Amino acid sequence: LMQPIQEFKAFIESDPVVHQEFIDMFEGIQDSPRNYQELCNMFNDIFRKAPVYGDLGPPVYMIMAKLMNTRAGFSAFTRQRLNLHFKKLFDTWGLFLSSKDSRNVLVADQFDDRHCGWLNERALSAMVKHYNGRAFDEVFLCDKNAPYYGFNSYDDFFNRRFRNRDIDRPVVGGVNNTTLISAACESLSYNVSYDVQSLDTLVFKGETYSLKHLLNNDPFTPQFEHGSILQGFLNVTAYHRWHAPVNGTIVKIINVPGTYFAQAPSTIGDPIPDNDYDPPPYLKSLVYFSNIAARQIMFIEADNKEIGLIFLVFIGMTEISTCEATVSEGQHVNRGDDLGMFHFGG
């Protein structure tokens, strides 16, 4: 086992309460992983190779979902001490996913009955579903004649840039109209909430925002009391970069450590569907865990004074939880410019 997994296992064993949680969470599980030792062994496989196309979510989520859906698992996964280890595991994995060796999934090869490479036409088709008949190599900047479509790693492919946003994803109304706020991420609508507030605990009102938590007690928090929040979900095959939603100035960027595998407690025990039209408990938890997940908060001062101070929160989910800003505090940006991107990592 690679050293980070060793230290992870040693931590589980170092505290009898944590250890007990990593036993009870497996109760009656007949499939692999059946205990925390098999979990560690499967991590050791997963972190040495790049993900493939086919599953409903990324590979760590897939083997974790049954555990996350228990009380014991939620307890374990809401300890900052344990989450420090998940961070180091996923950061270690992300190293490999930035390396030339992770290109081997950037192929058309079918790998088994249910999985294929990312350049297979099944996957190529899925990734341009919302681009109105344009093809993958038209939409995204790549080389369709090169091996691995020209990407130098999996992360490079995951964070592929648009070849020509003015055709496929235009800044609607033009950068000069400052009365408009753009979507920051290619996503699906998940929740809108009005008159948002702060809560003293995140209990029994699951799927409610708590500004104080979401924004990690920032001094700006009171300004957003009674305001509104729109939240989107990015599919695993979606464009994963961030664009500036307004012309404005970056006021403040805060990186907040948090959870990776915490679903909403109200959903613990709900069925985990064996299909894809039905959302599993974790994907019904995005509002809840925006309060506590590893995330980056970005405050922007819109050039249009009638829009003023806004915030963005980029919210991690399981192994896709690294939030890289490519802008700096004080910098000016126009609607549609890069703010940063998501990566596999902690």
Added chain:
Amino acid sequence: SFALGLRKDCRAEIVEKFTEPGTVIRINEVVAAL
């Protein structure tokens, strides 16, 4: 996942079609307007 936050004093209003979960959000498209 991502979230956009607007102040109450902000005269911009989220575009109503996005209050329905599952609606497609094309990056750079308008999600709120004055």
